[PDB]
Amino acid sequence: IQLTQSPSFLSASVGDRVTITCRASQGISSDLAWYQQKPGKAPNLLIYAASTLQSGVPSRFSGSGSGTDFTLTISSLQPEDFATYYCQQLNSDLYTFGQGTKLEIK
């Protein structure tokens, strides 16, 4: 399967509403995990099953979409909310990731 994030380089100031899109080419409908990676650090779960808040993630992070469309929504940005954001195929055999979207506190 092929996962495509859109778009790669993304910029906004603090407080903006961001919508990072990882687009599923076939349509899987429940198998997404949102991976935020501080530059040169260890990634962490943000939303698993594409809609539910993984424990300890602050409530400003949300996920939405099911089927062929999927999105990452951040309700209110923070100066530390810059990272490279990954989408992953859950319940798979190759665990295909996306290319990576680099949000920038700009």
Binding site: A42, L45, Y48, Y86, Q88, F97, G98, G100
Partner: protein
Amino acid sequence: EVQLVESGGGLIQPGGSLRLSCAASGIIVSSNYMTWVRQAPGKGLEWVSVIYSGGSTFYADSVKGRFTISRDKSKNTLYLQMSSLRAEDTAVYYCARDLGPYGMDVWGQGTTVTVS
């Protein structure tokens, strides 16, 4: 509490042999899905291998015939037999625990492997 620590990578001649190690505290390696994940410089994450809780193994198309994943129940540790190393194997590898619908809940710090 749940910590993965990795060792064994380093600068190695092309086609040579090498092995990684991934000690686990808290998680029992011998009954959970452990995966090897690769990240080339200037690139993203990519899958390498997974060894099942029952002991069944799996590797990627770019990995078959070259690497081997291995374990120890006494030391609660995860290993990766590194062999026939080409130039494309230069990457940083993390060990992660696979739970299916649940994502890679815990991760390792990562070790840099360079080929020259």
